[PDB]
Design a binder for this molecule. Structure first.
Ligand code: SRM
Ligand code: SRM
Ligand code: SF4
Ligand code: SF4
Ligand code: SF4
Ligand code: SF4
Ligand code: SF4
Ligand code: SF4
Ligand code: SF4
Ligand code: SF4
Ligand SMILES: O=S([O-])[O-]
Ligand SMILES: O=S([O-])[O-]
Lengths: 435, 385, 104, 385, 435, 104
């Protein structure tokens, strides 16, 4: 154990301390009550604290640049990493992270998680990240020799694969969808599971110009933030009318039912005011509340979810469901952050989701050939143009594709559109216009 | 010492199983969920951190959401499994913000579960499974690796998050805000996570150009890649001479460098981290849902606050100040961005007491123009005095 | 570290890549040979290595996967059948090129 | 005979007066203006085309606004002067939209003036001084040179303007719109005038890359200027042949050329004018006042309409349709841009019946991304069918 | 020549026909009632019609590229033009446009205009543009030998100078300001007139990287469209409170005073509704209407002018007046259209206008040196950055300078504001972090 | 047209500029003086002509006014005192350079 003045301070406070937890695991591996023959140093977590403490002191990371390790057959799935003071912290000389494929929306059973922990305690640090941002179960810290041993156990004993890493299709993830939400417009988890199984080869072997991600939201609320954190975002919606229970509406106005299902209960906002809290906040102003009756001009409803979110017991989603496809979202580097741009307003989203898969593969065929080295789909779109994206996906341009038409007249026309083409003879021109 | 799994390093491709993907979610579904999936009627938030969903047939499933450090030990994961075995027939799940939810089908079992969870603390005193995170609250913080594992961080992740949640603990165990307030942190400008679309975002940034290891760069780097890694074209290929030796290398125009560190990502010979130079930039106003207003990016309101381990006082105080002013001045259902859109930027700075600096004015390419103000519409504030 | 094979000495990093491209020699391929899941080198393993080396010398970088496949004519699947670790950790390492960088 | 002004070509600098600028506006003020300037209390619009301003001391000044063709003869200017002398003590002024305004200080003179103006017509028929242009109407059209004088046009200016005002004349002499509708035309993308900030903008555009006169280019052109004049980098220096010899010239990549003609502006050996290729792009939604909503650019809604002299029926019909639908669907005080911002673009096209084309989707540099739709919010229209 | 079937069609219709007007001038020159000895062909306008008619048939312009003519001492002011069919239309072989400096806001006397017409009838085509879009009086069409003759008579007999053209300061123009408007916050005409005289050197002799324009608006309504059509826009406003006369407010509510001064009298919108037409439309919602009294929370008023525009007899501008300076507006070529960006939120606007002039001169000092060839101020701002513009004008950065702060983290810092500076030794770094 | 002067021939356009810079000769200047309001050619005039000619040959374009003044040391006012029509119609024309373009 190394003295940790600074980290100890992070053991105080009400919020679950990651330090106290790591310490407990250091204690556990120290007693080793199971009698395990630890494949990497029992004191691995101890040195992890030690080096983190060092970083707190000097304010600078102590991990060497990159690292290249993995398992035969795959071009990714494991993030190598070596500390830059191996002498001082031998326990983390090698501290590789392994990304493990997780079940859609993260539903688990004790037996399963326990079996994974059994494997990790023996061949790992005992430390994890319960789900990296993309979704993977993260096994934080092990040595090179254990990589294939771990992979053998995961696939042969736990029937579980690795997640993705590198210039391919990363681990997909979805909101819990229909499993426990009345707003879900399609089975997000199923699409996610099926598509993950379908493109296993694209996920395990880098074949793309750069990384590519899938995320699936059940409705515009974006619980998995698909249109902000994935290149291909599938967001559910409907195309018919919202279902309105007039009797339930009276219950809200009367005060029986709590607005937004009691989400603002910890504060006094006054009695529910359907006009001020619903009708008057509707983006399009397509709602009406007259003589105790609530009405919606669905034709002008952008289905933003607000009214439904506020009166869950009185307003339901439509029955003619599907999804919108938005593409290009990415973090800033290089050219700047991007959110999903609407590509397909409404598409069928029923098992086995062929229509969705068609768009995916069409985009890949294009981007795999046109994308520059390390250029995200979003960036390729900016460089080559949205119109190009439309052509390769066989998508007809509609007003819905823009938030606003162009305000510059630098318009490109295809030669076939212009009568006479572009082959001209200045000679004939001078015939009418002298120099 | 070594214990084999059955793998044969002499025949690495024999008996290798591949492309099986993850286990299917349905194999871990609690009975009540598997039975009523897609047949939900409505839901309601009973208390902070507790929900109930009601199927169209009448069945009910109660959910208890608990806070978690994300970075956790197998012992913690086992303790969560012990709890699920005790009250939930072994079932449990994790949210997209890394909180843990336990589900039961009756109110008595629920009451028992909650009382138990509340009886779980570490030796040092922190709650192991604090209940909350629902409704208009401040749920967990989406964060990254920091000094725990990454080589490109400009700040830590776990430390700041613990410090901030300790300050914003009341807001996690209660629902008194105008709307949800999502806080996320990114260890470097790669901005892994949701920094660019959160109500409050925190990103580690550098303030000094990279050091260049001319002697070894060539051998260590693919030059062209480092050159193409720069958004401002600060890097160019050169023929350098070190110790009387001719070697290929790159030169950085410190006047075009904004210390993004992307070149280092592509080349180990261009390290940039600095204990005093690195810090955190604070952003606000983003949101991803399409409720009422369209999604939006978070905007930089404080260009730099220093790293102050282990509790980052300066940064933490500003975050709390933002939440306090917002909570008080915002209207019902207003996200922090919705709020700033209504009151205006000069007013936001005026209410929060935050210093405005030219660093917050965009100067990155053609698009920067759109961030300037092309209208005579403005309010007089102390800024113009 | 310092490697000693067939009377040769190679400077290597923690990942097994040559610290200097110019220090490459056939002996090297025979050294890392087994660590990359390859029992015997074939005319195909060579054609790839040769291409990667010609490319690097000409462009200062390793070629994109699509280019490696297009030129050699080897599909991704075939590349892996030849180098189980893949084009990066496998072929590039054996060809003497510097360790891959970026996400992963 | 040669009637000299006194200038001496042999001694050009002798007796030369310079840097005197324009005459001071004060010298031409009507007495009632000169006296009450800066002391106005309020104003009232009495009728279409007639205003009254009341000074703090009770003095009044009545203004009658008349439409004008901008391109006018000395004879017509002398007629305005004739009228000015008859009813306004020789005073008059021109507006920022090129209309003419006559001012008088009493009601009776106003009646006489107005009665007289209505009787002035050309032989052909047209009104000489049509009264109108005030309030919520369409007051003249800001325009350019066209084929009357410029060398870079893609269409005419006076012709189209005359055709459009004829069809919208009823909108000039009445105040029935939800707000002012500003129309502007520019014969080429240099867009002189106010096409980029008007409710409806008309701009001339080409659809064919420029022709190259290799034999004289390097003689008449400063090649670096032609290269730098291209927004899309389609112009590059090259060696060409003339009489079998080697000459310096330029090469244009038709795939990067969007026919703006800026290279022709800089180089006379790159003409691109074309009768069948040239046409007009139509834009809508811009404004320059800061009333309620901030100012905005006009957006391209119809990428191309052919040139059809002398009355451009296709273009004229499009403009009329937009005004009619807008006037019938917009709320009071709503400018076309306001209206469209309220109903949405898909609804705009649905209501107008205008066909949308991918040509309207922005593809010029990184800012283009912002014109795309980063939200799930959209309405179902026949376009999705 | 004379046969003009297409143009004749444009003599039909109500709107004043430029064709009928040009034909009248042709008839006048043919008759020559005053026995003038025309110094260019009497048939000049006749050939103009003939060549225009030709262009109407071919759909193509018939003016040769550019032209370089002018008067000694100046580097601009005349836009030369030669027809591309000299033989077919000798009348317009030369057809130069002379830009004549106009009085601020275009007030005229018949004596002055007639004097101008006398000179142009004798030495020009008899055609004009009563005001080019920038403001100048336009004399449409003459021959080169008359340029010096016209300039001589204009200066010596009419005390009138030429307007601007080229890479210099163009003719400034203003709205009518205080001459006949109650919303005017400063004397727009006087500022326009004084600066035009002050910068005569910069307007007649091209010394700039490119063109530069001045436009002055008395208030945000923008009647001269300065923050769209000028590089340097001055737009008046006030700093104190909106003046409210409740008695006048009541007259509007009662119907005695018509909303917007009767601007919408042509349609039956219904009786005035102060709530729906003013209080409810205020962009900041800073207005209140209660117990019959109208109030405004001036601190949250952006002075957009809407309420004042709607009830001009009841709501008036404040007494503490000045103006805002917005810069960089331009048409598209090359990098895209631009409207003025707020630089100085509030500045003094009284003669001799030293405060405004100081900003102007500070901008030129910088732009004249840093601006690339034929790069508008707006584009220099994009290229070099708003921050630089603030430094050269000695302006403190304030929130009012942005519509939105940046959402990319590519923040530049000054070395001097970073402890330790930028000179670092890799070997020292190598002491804390092993390679 | 073609200017005939002192046994030389100079192809020009309607504005007096040489169609071909290469056709420039000292005679061209003596010919243009009058039309450009110049009585006698001074060394200062020549200094400017030479500069313009050098810059054009080197850069393929006429130099910006600020550069002309910077190198020659002549402020604009002086430039006009030497060439009444200005740097363009005046000096460039006489230096044999091509007619200026763009919006005036
Ligand atoms: C005469 C006039 C059009 C009219 O009929 O009203 C005009 C005419 C020309 N403009 Fe302009 N512009 C005229 C108002 C404008 C305006 C509006 C304004 O000033 O209020 C603009 C937009 C504001 C701006 O400055 O951007 C304007 C933006 C341009 C541009 C685009 C500049 C840019 O940075 O985007 C060009 C192209 C260029 O300069 O290379 C241009 C170019 C030209 C040239 C000089 C093209 C050429 O090389 O011959 C045109 C001469 C036509 C001719 O044959 O006489 N003109 N031009 C206007 C004269 C005003 C005056 O009083 O003298
Ligand atoms: C005469 C003229 C001023 C001048 O020559 O210097 C003028 C005069 C007045 N403009 N505006 C004049 C050009 C402009 C322009 C410039 C342009 O269109 O090119 C604009 C910008 C257009 C835009 O907003 O994009 C302009 C936007 C306004 C507005 C803002 C209206 C809005 O709803 O957005 C107002 C306010 C109002 O109407 O209540 C206004 C208001 C006024 C008032 C009511 C001010 C006053 O108290 O006297 C003046 C009488 C208007 C009337 O017709 O009753 N004038 N006013 C110009 C006449 C042009 C014409 O012949 O029709
Ligand atoms: S994204 Fe919509 S469907 Fe999915 S969990 Fe959230 S609210 Fe339910
Ligand atoms: S889902 Fe949004 S857009 Fe449609 S009615 Fe409800 S609040 Fe209005
Ligand atoms: S936010 Fe930066 S530091 S974790 Fe992601 S790449 Fe490492
Ligand atoms: S740190 Fe970023 S901006 Fe500086 S040289 Fe490296 S890539 Fe360029
Ligand atoms: S340059 Fe000539 S054509 Fe083009 S809109 Fe201005 S008038
Ligand atoms: S027309 Fe326009 S886009 Fe085509 S070559 Fe010339 S400057 Fe470039
Ligand atoms: S810009 Fe304001 S001050 Fe000038 S005439 Fe228009 S309304 Fe009156
Ligand atoms: S001037 Fe505009 S912002 Fe100020 S109160 Fe009137 S309407 Fe509201
Ligand atoms: O730094 S590691 O990748 O050798
Ligand atoms: O075409 S003109 O400029 O000679």
């Amino acid at each position: 154990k190394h003295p940790t003045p600074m980290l100890d301070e992070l053991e105080k406070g009400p919020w679950p301390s990651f330090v106290s937890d790591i310490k407990q695991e250091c204690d556990n591996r120290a007693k080793n009550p199971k009698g395990l023959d630890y494949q990497i140093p029992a004191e691995c977590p101890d040195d992890l604290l030690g080096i983190l403490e060092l970083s707190f002191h000097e304010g600078e990371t102590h991990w060497k640049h990159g690292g290249i390790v993995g398992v035969f057959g795959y071009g990714g799935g494991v993030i190598g990493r070596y500390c830059d003071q191996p002498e001082m912290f031998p326990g983390v000389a090698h501290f590789h992270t392994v990304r493990l494929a997780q079940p859609a929306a993260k539903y688990y059973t004790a037996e399963y998680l326990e079996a994974i922990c059994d494997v990790w305690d023996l061949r790992g640090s005992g430390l994890t990240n319960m789900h990296g941002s993309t979704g993977d179960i993260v096994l934080l810290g092990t040595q090179t020799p254990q990589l294939e041993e771990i992979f053998f156990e995961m696939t042969h004993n736990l029937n579980t694969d690795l997640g993705g890493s590198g210039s391919n299709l990363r681990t997909p993830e979805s909101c819990l969808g229909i499993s426990r939400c009345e707003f879900a417009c399609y089975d997000t988890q199923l699409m996610c599971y099926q598509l993950t199984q379908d493109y296993q080869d694209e996920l395990h072997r880098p074949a793309f110009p750069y990384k590519f991600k899938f995320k699936f939201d059940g409705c515009p609320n974006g619980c998995v933030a698909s249109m902000a954190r994935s290149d291909f975002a599938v967001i559910g919606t409907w195309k018919d009318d919202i279902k309105i229970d007039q009797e339930a509406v009276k219950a809200y106005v009367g005060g029986e039912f709590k607005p937004n299902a009691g989400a603002h209960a910890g504060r006094d906002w006054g009695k529910f005011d359907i006009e001020a809290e619903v009708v008057g906040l509707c983006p399009t102003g397509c709602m009406t509340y007259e003589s105790g009756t609530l009405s919606i001009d669905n034709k002008n409803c952008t289905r933003c979810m607000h009214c439904i979110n506020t009166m869950p017991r009185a307003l339901k989603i439509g029955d003619e469901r599907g999804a919108s496809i938005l593409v290009g979202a990415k973090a800033p580097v290089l050219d700047g952050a991007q959110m999903g741009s609407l590509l397909i307003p409404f598409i069928a989203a029923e098992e086995p989701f062929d229509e969705v898969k068609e768009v995916i593969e069409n985009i890949w065929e294009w981007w795999m050939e046109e994308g520059k080295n390390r250029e995200r789909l979003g960036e390729t779109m900016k460089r080559v143009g949205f119109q190009k994206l439309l052509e390769v996906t066989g998508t007809k341009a509609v007003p819905q594709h823009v938030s606003e038409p162009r305000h510059n007249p630098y318009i490109f026309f295809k030669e076939e559109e212009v009568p006479g083409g572009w082959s001209r003879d200045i000679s004939d021109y001078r015939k009418r216009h002298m120099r | 010492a070594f214990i084999s799994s059955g793998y044969n390093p002499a025949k690495p491709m024999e008996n290798r199983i591949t492309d099986i993907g993850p286990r299917k979610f349905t194999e871990f579904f609690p009975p009540v969920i598997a039975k009523n999936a897609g047949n939900w009627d409505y839901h309601e938030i009973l208390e902070p951190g507790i929900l109930v969903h009601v199927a169209k047939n009448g069945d009910k499933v109660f959910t208890v959401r608990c806070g978690a450090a994300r970075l956790m030990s197998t012992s913690h994961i086992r303790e969560a499994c012990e709890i699920a075995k005790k009250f939930c027939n072994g079932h449990l799940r994790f949210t997209t913000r890394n909180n843990i939810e336990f589900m039961v089908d009756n109110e008595e079992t629920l009451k028992a579960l909650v009382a138990d969870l509340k009886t779980r603390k570490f030796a040092a005193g922190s709650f192991k499974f604090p209940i909350g995170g629902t409704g208009a609250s401040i749920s967990n913080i989406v964060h990254t690796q920091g000094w725990v594992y990454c080589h490109t961080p400009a700040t830590d992740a776990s430390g700041p998050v613990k410090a901030v949640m300790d300050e914003l603990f009341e807001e996690f165990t209660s629902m008194r805000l105008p709307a949800i307030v999502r806080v996320s942190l990114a260890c470097c400008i790669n901005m892994c996570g949701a920094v660019h679309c959160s109500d409050i975002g925190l990103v580690g940034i550098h303030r000094k150009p990279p050091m260049i290891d001319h002697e070894n760069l060539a051998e260590l780097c693919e030059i062209p890649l480092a050159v193409a890694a720069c958004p401002t074209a600060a890097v160019k290929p050169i023929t350098a001479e070190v110790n009387g030796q001719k070697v290929k290398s790159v030169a950085i125009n410190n006047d075009r460098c904004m210390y993004c560190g992307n070149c280092y990502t592509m080349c180990p010979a261009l390290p940039l981290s600095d204990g005093t130079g690195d810090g955190i930039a604070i952003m606000v106003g983003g949101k991803i849902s399409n409720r009422i207003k369209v999604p939006s990016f978070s905007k930089v309101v404080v260009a730099f606050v220093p790293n102050e381990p282990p509790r980052w006082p300066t940064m933490a105080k500003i975050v709390k100040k933002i939440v306090e002013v917002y909570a008080e001045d915002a209207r019902k259902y207003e996200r922090i961005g919705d709020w700033i859109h209504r009151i205006g930027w000069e007013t936001f700075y005026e209410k929060t007491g935050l210093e405005f600096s030219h660093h917050c004015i965009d100067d990155f390419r053609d698009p920067a123009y759109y961030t300037w103000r092309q209208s005579t519409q403005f309010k007089f504030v102390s800024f113009d005095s | 570290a310092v490697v000693e094979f067939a009377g040769s000495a190679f400077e290597v990093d923690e990942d097994g890549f040559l610290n200097a491209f110019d220090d490459w020699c056939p002996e090297w391929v025979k050294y890392a040979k087994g660590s990359e899941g390859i029992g015997a080198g074939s005319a195909d393993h060579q054609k790839i290595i040769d291409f990667l080396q010609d490319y690097y010398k000409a462009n200062g970088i390793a070629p994109m996967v699509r280019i490696l496949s297009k030129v050699t004519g080897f599909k991704l699947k075939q590349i892996y059948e030849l180098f189980p670790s893949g084009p990066g950790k496998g072929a590039c390492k054996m060809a003497g090129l510097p360790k891959p960088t970026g996400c992963v």
